[PDB]
């Protein structure tokens, strides 16, 4: 038996299918037992049994190609994926993580670890484009799935693979982390739109770690502030967790609970 898997297809995707998919993903990410100021906390990496460490997301498209992404439950972030007979992993940041990912796709005949990490800075560099310039929506995700699949046949060049990772991470991992970002993807489906993320989304993505800390270290929710951006790119400060309730869906574990 196995890590949990959640399925989603871009083919005939609707606001409802996407929403229910993201909700299912969150359910496999947090236990529901650690909630702080109403925001769920992800499992603490320290002491976490390896059989609890990962979940799989099976993505398919209208071209009928499928890939499975692996997400780390401790951060909701993509550590690698499988297509056909091969799995591909980002370079791990430490030896524990390096050891953890060896328990993924153990079924697969070929397992490759990239020489680079999966952080946006590295991926933007490999892609030769910023998040600001990379459109998101069902169309881009449909195409990103094909690109990841054909990486495994040699049909996808590295910069396109980087760009496709940038799309997948945002529409899956960041959507899972932030209701606000799930909402941004919902709207794109509703209107059949593809468009790049605006500054509001980019700053939340960049800030997810800092927000997790501020929230967990707050006095009854009051921060010891975090600067975000509005959609027009103007700066605003968050002082308190209350405003973030509709915004941030889960947090990386920082400190012991109340």
């Amino acid at each position: 038996k196995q890590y949990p898997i959640i399925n989603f297809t871009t083919a005939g995707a609707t606001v409802q299918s996407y929403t229910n998919f993201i909700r299912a993903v969150r359910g496999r990410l947090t236990t529901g037992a650690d909630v702080r100021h109403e925001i769920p906390v992800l499992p603490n990496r320290v002491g976490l049994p390896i059989n609890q460490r990962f979940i799989l997301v099976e993505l398919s498209n209208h071209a009928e190609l499928s890939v499975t992404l692996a997400l780390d439950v401790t951060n909701a972030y993509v550590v690698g994926y499988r297509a056909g007979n091969s799995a591909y992993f980002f370079h791990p940041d430490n030896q524990e993580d390096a050891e953890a990912i060896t328990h993924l796709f153990t079924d697969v005949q070929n397992r490759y670890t990239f020489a680079f990490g999966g952080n946006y800075d590295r991926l933007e560099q490999l892609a030769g484009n910023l998040r600001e310039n990379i459109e998101l929506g069902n169309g881009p995700l449909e195409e990103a799935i094909s690109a990841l699949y054909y990486y495994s046949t040699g049909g996808t060049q590295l910069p396109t693979l980087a760009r496709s990772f940038i799309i997948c991470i945002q529409m899956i991992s960041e959507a899972a982390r932030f209701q606000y970002i799930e909402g941004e993807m919902r709207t794109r489906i509703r209107y059949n739109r593809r468009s790049a993320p605006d500054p509001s989304v980019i700053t939340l993505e960049n800030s997810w770690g800092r927000l997790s800390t501020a929230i967990q270290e707050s006095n009854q929710g009051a921060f010891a502030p975090i600067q975000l951006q509005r959609r027009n790119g103007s700066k605003f400060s968050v002082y308190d967790v209350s405003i973030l309730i509709p915004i941030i869906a889960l947090m990386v574990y920082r400190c012991a609970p109340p």
């Epitope: 509005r230 027009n232 605003f236 002082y239 308190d240 209350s242 405003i243 973030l244 509709p246």
Partner: nanobody, 120 residues
Framework: QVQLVESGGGLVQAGGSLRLSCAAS????????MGWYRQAPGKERELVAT???????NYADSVKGRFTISGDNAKNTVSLQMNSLKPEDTAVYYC???????????????WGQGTQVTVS
């Protein structure tokens, strides 16, 4: 629990100058737009000067180059410097503030109760 506090106004000589100030409390977030509208008696209320969170200002054509608005986002305050006062400027001035999304609101808008400026 938004509250606007307006200061300034009163009787002033033609050619003089004064300052209006407005400070919003009870907004957990900074204003989207803040500024003044005025209503001259027998007239419709009209925009005078507003400023945005981006610090962009908008003025009535008739006060442009006479009035200056400035703002402080972090304190949710705006100030209107009124120079070269003219008869047309006699009116009740109303502070207005609008705020964008913060839970549980998508937005809100707020009016002051007005302060009269009378040019003698």
């Amino acid at each position: 629990q938004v509250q606007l506090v307006e200061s300034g106004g009163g009787l002033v000589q033609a050619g003089g100058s004064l300052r209006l100030s407005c400070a919003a409390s009870g907004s957990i977030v900074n204003f989207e737009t803040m500024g003044w509208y005025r209503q001259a008696p027998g007239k419709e209320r009209e925009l005078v000067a507003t400023i945005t969170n981006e610090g962009s200002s908008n003025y009535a054509d008739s006060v442009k180059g006479r009035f200056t608005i400035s703002g402080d986002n972090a304190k949710n305050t705006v100030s209107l410097q009124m120079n070269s006062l003219k008869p047309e400027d006699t009116a009740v001035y109303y502070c207005s503030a609008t705020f964008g999304s913060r839970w549980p609101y998508a937005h809100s808008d707020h009016w002051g109760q007005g302060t009269q400026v009378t040019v003698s």
